[PDB]
Amino acid sequence: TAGYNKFLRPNFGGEPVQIALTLDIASISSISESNMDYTATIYLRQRWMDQRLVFEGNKSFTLDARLVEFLWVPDTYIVESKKSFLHEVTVGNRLIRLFSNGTVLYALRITTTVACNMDLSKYPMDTQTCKLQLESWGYDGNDVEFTWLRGNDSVRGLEHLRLAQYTIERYFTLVTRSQQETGNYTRLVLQFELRRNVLYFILETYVPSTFLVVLSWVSFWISLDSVPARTCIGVTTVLSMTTLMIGSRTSLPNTNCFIKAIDVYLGICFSFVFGALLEYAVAHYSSLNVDHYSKLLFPLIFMLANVFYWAYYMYF
Amino acid sequence: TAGYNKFLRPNFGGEPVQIALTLDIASISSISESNMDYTATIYLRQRWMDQRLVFEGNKSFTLDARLVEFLWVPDTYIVESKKSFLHEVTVGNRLIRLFSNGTVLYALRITTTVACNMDLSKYPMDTQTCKLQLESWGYDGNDVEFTWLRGNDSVRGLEHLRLAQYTIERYFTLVTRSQQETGNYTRLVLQFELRRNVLYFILETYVPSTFLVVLSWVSFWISLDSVPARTCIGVTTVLSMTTLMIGSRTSLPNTNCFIKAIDVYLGICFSFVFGALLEYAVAHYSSLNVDHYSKLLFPLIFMLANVFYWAYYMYF
Amino acid sequence: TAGYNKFLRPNFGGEPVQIALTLDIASISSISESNMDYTATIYLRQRWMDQRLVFEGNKSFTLDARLVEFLWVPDTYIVESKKSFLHEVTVGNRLIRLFSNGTVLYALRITTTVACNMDLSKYPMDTQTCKLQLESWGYDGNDVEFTWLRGNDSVRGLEHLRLAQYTIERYFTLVTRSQQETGNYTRLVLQFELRRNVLYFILETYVPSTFLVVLSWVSFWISLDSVPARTCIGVTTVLSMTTLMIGSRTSLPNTNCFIKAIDVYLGICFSFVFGALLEYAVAHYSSLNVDHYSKLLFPLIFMLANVFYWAYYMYF
Amino acid sequence: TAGYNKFLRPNFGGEPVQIALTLDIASISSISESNMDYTATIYLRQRWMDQRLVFEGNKSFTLDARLVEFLWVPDTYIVESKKSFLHEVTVGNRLIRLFSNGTVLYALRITTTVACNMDLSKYPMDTQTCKLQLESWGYDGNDVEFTWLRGNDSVRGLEHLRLAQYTIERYFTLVTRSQQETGNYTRLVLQFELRRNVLYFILETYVPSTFLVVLSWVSFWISLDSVPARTCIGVTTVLSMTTLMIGSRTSLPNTNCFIKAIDVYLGICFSFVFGALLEYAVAHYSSLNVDHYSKLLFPLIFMLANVFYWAYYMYF
Amino acid sequence: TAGYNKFLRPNFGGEPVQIALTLDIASISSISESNMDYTATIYLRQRWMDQRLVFEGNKSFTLDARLVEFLWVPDTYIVESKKSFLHEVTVGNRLIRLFSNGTVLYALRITTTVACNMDLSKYPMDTQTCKLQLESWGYDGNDVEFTWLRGNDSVRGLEHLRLAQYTIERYFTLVTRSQQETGNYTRLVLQFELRRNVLYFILETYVPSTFLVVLSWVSFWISLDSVPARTCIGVTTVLSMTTLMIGSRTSLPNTNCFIKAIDVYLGICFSFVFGALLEYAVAHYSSLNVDHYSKLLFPLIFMLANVFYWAYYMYF
């Protein structure tokens, strides 16, 4: 038999509730470039002070998940979560650990699929900046005031995340004053950058294509007298380049149409190989020295093209 | 101990309930051409006036999700939703914010998979018109009357949606009088067009095929005396075209059989390349000038074909 | 405080319950040839007469989903449903609209994955007959008697279904007397045929292969003197045919092994192309007129083969 | 107000409960070679005798799913189920039909994903023996004694199962005495064999490869004088074989690494084709009759290889 | 009517609860290299002593899943579980079997998707060490003390696990003292290694590539006089190698970018084949004995490369 002495939010009217958040990223996975999202498991720890549960004697009361519904808990929500759930492995992953002075420790295990934009302009050399924002979904700023428990180091576990492709290169936590239709709210934003592994992509596509085109333009040293050999090398290189392009197109079936960087490099290599074939034909027609078109023509143009490519994907 | 004074719909008998809807599209994703649907997360805000909850003093009562079931809430439903759920991240995403004069603000976070037809006649240059209709699923028009809170600008967040392929080019909200078996209903329709990104598809397929066929028909300037060179160019171009067609067929495994536009263009390019091969054979047979069949034959026919293609996909 | 006056099925003992069913197919999608099923969203309207809820005054009582559990509702089930759920978008999609004389209108929004056999003997020219059967799962025929409200026109919405591949060509509703172990039951069967779109498949595979083989057998008009040209055409056609076959094998990765029709046609085309190559070799050996083997040999055999193919896929 | 007279298991102490099981396989689908499982929908009928619900008068009481929780029901579980659920289409699929003498008929509609090993040593000619075991998960043998209602014919519906690939060739039901840590249990095992459709796989891979190699070794009758023709046939056959192998590798992307049978046959065909090429080179070198290496060399070795292959996949 | 005599954890204050865990892995499946996880079904048996449920007479009380919530059960959780659920096949898979002296046997059937890192540096010859850690999620070490019932042999069923690719080669159970923010905890870790099946991968890629390159470098014994034969062999081998590389790239579409071992070996084979082509051209240019570059050049370099490869993937 309880009335208004157990249901109202702490300090209902007056000073807002100071809720201190602590985060512990257990894992990050299912980062899809098609849906532009990421799945992460986090340990959401919330600490606030309530004046109505002061009990004598210094000790802790680790409550179960069944008694969580009997007390007041914050209404934190992930701002851009597309699908999420609280873990129920054997019991409910909801603990409340009350303390003598009224400190409440509310810990949850939540798997969230947050939505972050994948600006895949430079597909293999991109650092996607994805955030995990937490906000009091119902209560405005004047009612609930979110805060980070220990500044930047409140979020833990991100330094141990080594993923299939990405590596965390930076992370920082900030508190904002997000304004929307309902009113003023405090949003706790955790911002981390997912730098891709360029080394695998370099050896997968850039190194083979570079070696192929190098073999193509060093074949000009072979004299025009050996026509069938030159035709064989040209045909084999062109066919290998086409097969590589087709396989690369089929290798990653991601729904992320943003005219990527591998497309540009592959188009450059295809341009150089079929231009080498066309210039073989044109050189035969004009002869009616082939290495004069290699000593200072082809490797130099490809070097300039690579310089422009790397300048594009290096600076702004 | 409550009877009929708390369960009945507001103004039960007489003037219908004027419910004002406000929408906030958080994200749009999972747009599949196979299933012809789209997944969107929205903030459904409903505002109506109830005369039985007038409390003295100007203030707001931000209720939790547990007290939502104790009051009357509308029965809004998405007309063509295939699968949807209300978000439960930490607590229920259902708030009721009562006001002094009886205004009720009912906000929900719902992820919906609505079904919209994908008329993929022009696959890379289509603007799919997909709607998100909201209706009082049980109560007819004479009982519940839906309305947009602020006309066209009631829906927010659609201008910030940049997706993997599509870009929103238009959006407008209207109220209808949908007639069905149960009776008369008010349907709130939000109509938005998803224009595709043609630039990526142009460079992916149209530019390479155009360059290949251009190289094919400019090789007629090469004299018939260099037979092996011509056979090499023709064979390489035909093989490259076939590999490109096969890769394109395997590149997008979408279950959207509508004889698309890329199929038509690829068939045109394949027709031109194998016709070039056949005309090489026929030209040899008839010679028993090859550039006479290029100066005003092949590029001109391809130009006419491209003109017809673009006229088809430009106007009606 | 209610006993047996509110829990028992209407007319418990005596005349069975006459429940009239009305169906409204909202959408049909996710038709997979591998799992041999289809996902459909339907509006299940059930109308029966109950004598214990007669209230004075002509009017309707549109009840919510919370009061559905307080009254008796039928136990209709989809006979071959593999996975299904009732929609919960904002509230429960369960309405009961009582009337003065005891008529009860029970409407639900259900998404069902029913299992129907995909006899893919003729893969592109098949009309799969898939049913959506509804039955009183627990109560036998002597207890609950299902009926269609308005005969064939009880089911609505099927005429507006235009899908990715299939088009509805027929639909009809019937009532059966299905016999099983538990007893006698009334099953309401809705039978619809999903005719495939042959036009897309014709232009995708049949037209290119036909053009390729036509080019192959019209090359016999080219004299045997131009040996390298003939070898080039033969090699290019054979390679194109092999690539088309491989791409088609990889194009549709459906788990529906039924030796389909496209396989037969593709095998016929492959047989003709490699037979053309073999007959080139044999013709050279025997010459030691090639068009004598084309004027009345090859196109005529292919015409007979196509006649047999179309006769197989036309009649029985 | 009920105590121990309604909650205890029937015959608590003394003779164990004789529960007779009847099974009705509605469908079998989603048989994945990667996860090594199968999804099946079954009608689990359980019949036992309870002495505490004897009511006068011969009649049946078809109870709803809401009253199932008020009575005692067995704790049957599928032994190797990975994920399963009870169907809730419109109401709960749980009926209890009590009878005069205490017979209880408990019928459920359950979709189960049971795990069965896929020994894919002979991928296209395998008969996987997968079981569907049912056991009293909590109560041991001395408490609950499972039994089949009518021996082998208790399981019904398996004879009407025609699947995408497999065909049921045998089925039998047995009762065991499975021993585990908790104690002695009675396990009801339904064992069925899923024989694959070899006819589709024969025509898909074996027939084309056999025809290709036959064409390869009958080309030895062509004299060595026609060198370019022989090189053309050899190159075309080798390229076709390589493309077929690559497509087959990409055709089935199943995660079932068990060095299958199609791999062995394809390796044999690849060995024969590149050996034919190598022997062309070696025959030219040694000539410095080619059909002497065909009359009694190549088709005979391939015949011996096929004999060994079929002996391996025929007997032990 | 119960107060604090039935809700508190056993021995609340003083000696911690000694909970003995027993594990029974029913199945392991869905091991994905992309998400770096594994799905396993386990039988979690927990044994502890409670002093408040001592009943006279030696016997067992096998309680149902409905009475589990009425007693105290541990809060065990899987540390790195991404998604998990307790099985509900017919009833709840939660049994409590009390005994005379207070022993409680709590058995559950849980399907867990635990996250373990897939260090795919050596893709076909890796032994991934994945753990299944169980911990008292809420209560610290001073409150709940986890223990293995019978040391290493507490975990059962792992010896019968034969999977699609991996084979368990080792398994061991240990108890730790994991330290985190909340306090001191006892973590029960089961560590097992999943050794891959190298035999399938050897015959799939290593054997064909080795045979191809062997045929390539034994063709040097063929004299330079037979130029067209050498060009044919070289072109066929290069095309076969390129097709094999492309198919392998498309064969496994796993999102596990870690520059794997098959990539290195395939790059080595591609290097050798196109180097053989380049050296054919260079040998022709320099001749202006080819087997002098085979007797002690090519097979020896490939042997050294394979020695280095196997030394890398053998030792450290």
Ligand SMILES: *[C@@H]1O[C@H](CO)[C@@H](O[C@@H]2O[C@H](CO)[C@@H](O[C@@H]3O[C@H](CO)[C@@H](O[C@H]4O[C@H](CO)[C@@H](O)[C@H](O)[C@@H]4O)[C@H](O)[C@@H]3O)[C@H](O)[C@H]2NC(C)=O)[C@H](O)[C@H]1NC(C)=O
């Ligand atoms: C009963 O009490 C209610 C609460 O006190 C009253 O509701 C208020 O009604 C007034 C006008 O009638 C609202 O003022 C408007 O509010 C709009 C929405 O905030 C404003 O729009 C601006 O802000 C939005 C959100 O930022 C922008 O999207 C938009 O583009 C524009 O910039 C208007 O400019 C205007 O201020 C007020 O907000 C309402 N408050 C609430 C809490 O709903 C109601 O009128 C009372 N009724 C009676 C009969 O007295």
Ligand SMILES: *[C@@H]1O[C@H](CO)[C@@H](O[C@@H]2O[C@H](CO)[C@@H](O[C@@H]3O[C@H](CO)[C@@H](O[C@H]4O[C@H](CO)[C@@H](O)[C@H](O)[C@@H]4O)[C@H](O)[C@@H]3O)[C@H](O)[C@H]2NC(C)=O)[C@H](O)[C@H]1NC(C)=O
């Ligand atoms: C008990 O009270 C009930 C409610 O008052 C009575 O139900 C009504 O019964 C009459 C006929 O007995 C129904 O009239 C018909 O309704 C059909 C469905 O609306 C109409 O069909 C037309 O409309 C539908 C829907 O738009 C179209 O799909 C269809 O093609 C056609 O155009 C008929 O034309 C006809 O009007 C009436 O609708 C019923 N009302 C309800 C609410 O169910 C019932 O008869 C009473 N019983 C007794 C014994 O008195």
Ligand SMILES: *[C@@H]1O[C@H](CO)[C@@H](O[C@@H]2O[C@H](CO)[C@@H](O[C@@H]3O[C@H](CO)[C@@H](O[C@H]4O[C@H](CO)[C@@H](O)[C@H](O)[C@@H]4O)[C@H](O)[C@@H]3O)[C@H](O)[C@H]2NC(C)=O)[C@H](O)[C@H]1NC(C)=O
């Ligand atoms: C207590 O009361 C119960 C209900 O009144 C009694 O159950 C009945 O028991 C008799 C025999 O003891 C059953 O008769 C048999 O039923 C079989 C199943 O229906 C029949 O099999 C035939 O039909 C099935 C289903 O169509 C076919 O699959 C099968 O191949 C075959 O063709 C038998 O042929 C035979 O009739 C009767 O069905 C039971 N009824 C019910 C409702 O269970 C029970 O015996 C009573 N016990 C005592 C001790 O009196």
Ligand SMILES: *[C@@H]1O[C@H](CO)[C@@H](O[C@@H]2O[C@H](CO)[C@@H](O[C@@H]3O[C@H](CO)[C@@H](O[C@H]4O[C@H](CO)[C@@H](O)[C@H](O)[C@@H]4O)[C@H](O)[C@@H]3O)[C@H](O)[C@H]2NC(C)=O)[C@H](O)[C@H]1NC(C)=O
């Ligand atoms: C309180 O009462 C409890 C129940 O009466 C007592 O539990 C029993 O404790 C004894 C030993 O203390 C257990 O005996 C052992 O049980 C092991 C597990 O069954 C056996 O292992 C063998 O069997 C397992 C399972 O088949 C194999 O996996 C294993 O390899 C080996 O072959 C041992 O060999 C030995 O018998 C007994 O099982 C317990 N019974 C139960 C129901 O738990 C408890 O001791 C009592 N405590 C006190 C203080 O009196």
Ligand SMILES: *[C@@H]1O[C@H](CO)[C@@H](O[C@@H]2O[C@H](CO)[C@@H](O[C@@H]3O[C@H](CO)[C@@H](O[C@H]4O[C@H](CO)[C@@H](O)[C@H](O)[C@@H]4O)[C@H](O)[C@@H]3O)[C@H](O)[C@H]2NC(C)=O)[C@H](O)[C@H]1NC(C)=O
């Ligand atoms: C009310 O009672 C509460 C409980 O008794 C009090 O909370 C304690 O507050 C003190 C300081 O005010 C905390 O001490 C700090 O705790 C930090 C977190 O443990 C420590 O950080 C170190 O440990 C963490 C975790 O291992 C590391 O991540 C971190 O990098 C660093 O190494 C600090 O160093 C410091 O000890 C104490 O932990 C709090 N205890 C609990 C249970 O919350 C509260 O202050 C009381 N309030 C009043 C007004 O009296």
Ligand SMILES: *[C@@H]1O[C@H](CO)[C@@H](O)[C@H](O)[C@H]1NC(C)=O
């Ligand atoms: C640490 O927090 C401060 C705010 O106190 C912020 O300015 C700073 O940027 C944070 N550190 C990093 C690395 O972002």
Ligand SMILES: *[C@@H]1O[C@H](CO)[C@@H](O)[C@H](O)[C@H]1NC(C)=O
């Ligand atoms: C804005 O709303 C009006 C109705 O008041 C409608 O006519 C108009 O079309 C809307 N605007 C747009 C851009 O559609």
Ligand SMILES: *[C@@H]1O[C@H](CO)[C@@H](O)[C@H](O)[C@H]1NC(C)=O
């Ligand atoms: C319409 O219903 C009748 C039964 O009254 C049935 O015989 C007929 O076949 C149905 N119409 C069609 C097109 O099937």
Ligand SMILES: *[C@@H]1O[C@H](CO)[C@@H](O)[C@H](O)[C@H]1NC(C)=O
């Ligand atoms: C039928 O059941 C008997 C047991 O009574 C068993 O021996 C027999 O093998 C079963 N039939 C088949 C075909 O297995």
Ligand SMILES: *[C@@H]1O[C@H](CO)[C@@H](O)[C@H](O)[C@H]1NC(C)=O
């Ligand atoms: C068995 O347990 C002991 C601890 O008592 C541990 O040291 C040992 O390593 C375990 N066995 C194996 C094979 O790991």
